Design a protein around this ligand. Structure first.
Ligand SMILES: Nc1ncnc2c1ncn2[C@@H]1O[C@H](COP(=O)(O)OP(=O)(O)O)[C@@H](O)[C@H]1O
Ligand SMILES: Nc1ncnc2c1ncn2[C@@H]1O[C@H](COP(=O)(O)OP(=O)(O)O)[C@@H](O)[C@H]1O
Ligand SMILES: [Cl-]
Ligand SMILES: [Mg+2]
Ligand SMILES: [Mg+2]
Lengths: 233, 235
């Protein structure tokens, strides 16, 4: 029992007795594209929290610095409290969704090298896509910081891509958040579940949130499958 | 004036010459809004535009900027060096207005220091979407050293344009360049610099450009003329 700091779409965050620490609670809320149509869909919190807890641990073992300490419940994990960088970092391995739209090209076209993209994490501005100078202007981060957010998201792609391969899933794209820990450094934060990455079955089957949005099945099912596959590592 | 068409634009029909390397550009009386959506014929526009562009482009040439400009042929035409165009539209911003205002949710009118440069892919089917460096490399448009060149050149270009407009009392909010490759593969400033292509606020905040057409505040050639007049007071 402690205090609710922020209330999200997928997560409520609570405090502890340790200033630097925060327990994250994964909700059953699902919400579609920016025009937030809202459905609450059972089990989702637990899968997300499992998957995220797993990958994050795997990262930590691989020496990626992150906010993960321990999965504490079905529903909760304990995280190092960081000051969030309002900059969603998207790395793309394959064309899909908004890249496809922007460039009027199909989804499934491989890239090599992979492209990163910043978006201003500002719900009111509809999380707009931005460039390096816009970030500087925004005073989120200067140079050296911009080049760090790239350089580590790529390293993160390289680990993650290999792992999903080994369980027969192609890492199409994902989306990070980073923030500052009590010591000022930058640190992978938030969560890495099927909600914030794309996952393609070797047969093009979507093992991710595109099931809720495009509407190609029931969500917990594909998530269940991904969770099942991950414990093959 | 009689040779063949190379391509028709929304603002410019560009013709061939006997000189492979030279193009004669024809400025039209046509004005088109947002995503090519609404258009009108407005008389005098091409002429008005043709002088402004030739004049600015000349001044650039004398202040040491490589460009596609050779001479003004007449009311409606100028002669230009043929370039393989770079299908990037390069926007420099000094003050906030329009799209930057839209995306970032703040007012038209706030000074930026430093000025922001923004690439859009010149591809009308895609509505010239906004792109970032890595998309340009993707698109195979330029390598790094070249994107750096487009930047540093559009900057020293602002740092001339802003002054000249200052001296005649004009606020260079933003503009929009296009560069291309000359006969010897050198990047070179080209297309046009008219008020279709930039923002110029009055000291009273009055719109001395195509925003008159877009936001339908009144008629375009009034303002365009005022700028032509003002520009003629320079050197
Ligand atoms: N270590 C952390 N410290 C503080 N805030 C965090 C941390 N990790 C994640 N967050 C934030 O917690 C919020 C969780 O709510 P969520 O529903 O994920 O947000 P969103 O609706 O933006 O996806 C997010 O805004 C995220 O930035
Ligand atoms: N020196 C040049 N050589 C060849 N093409 C050019 C040159 N300058 C401009 N262009 C191209 O000619 C076309 C001019 O038509 P215009 O109406 O200005 O285009 P748009 O409708 O895209 O604004 C554009 O596609 C432009 O990039
Ligand atoms: Cl955009
Ligand atoms: Mg989130
Ligand atoms: Mg043009």
């Amino acid at each position: 029992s402690k205090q609710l700091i922020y209330s999200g779409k997928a997560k409520d965050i609570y405090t502890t007795e340790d200033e630097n620490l925060i327990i994250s609670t994964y909700k059953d809320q699902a919400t579609a594209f920016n025009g937030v149509k809202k459905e609450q869909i059972a089990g989702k919190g637990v899968l997300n929290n499992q998957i995220s807890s797993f990958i994050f641990e795997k990262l930590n073992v691989a020496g990626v610095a992150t906010h993960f300490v321990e999965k504490l419940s079905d529903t909760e994990q304990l995280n190092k409290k960081v000051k969030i960088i309002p900059l969603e970092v998207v790395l793309r391995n394959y064309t899909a969704g908004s890249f496809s739209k922007r460039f009027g090209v199909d989804e499934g076209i491989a890239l090599e090298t992979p492209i990163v993209e910043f978006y201003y994490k500002n719900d009111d501005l509809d999380d707009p896509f931005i460039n390096d100078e816009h970030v500087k202007f925004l005073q989120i981060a200067g140079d050296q910081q911009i080049a760090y957010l790239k350089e580590e998201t790529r390293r993160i792609n390289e680990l993650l891509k290999v792992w999903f391969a080994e369980i027969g899933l192609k890492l199409i794209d994902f989306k990070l958040e980073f923030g500052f820990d009590k010591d000022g450094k930058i640190i992978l934060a938030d969560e890495f579940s099927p909600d914030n990455c794309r996952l393609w079955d070797a047969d093009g089957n979507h093992m991710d949130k595109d099931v809720f949005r495009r509407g190609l099945g029931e969500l917990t099912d594909v998530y269940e499958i991904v969770w099942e596959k991950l414990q093959e590592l």
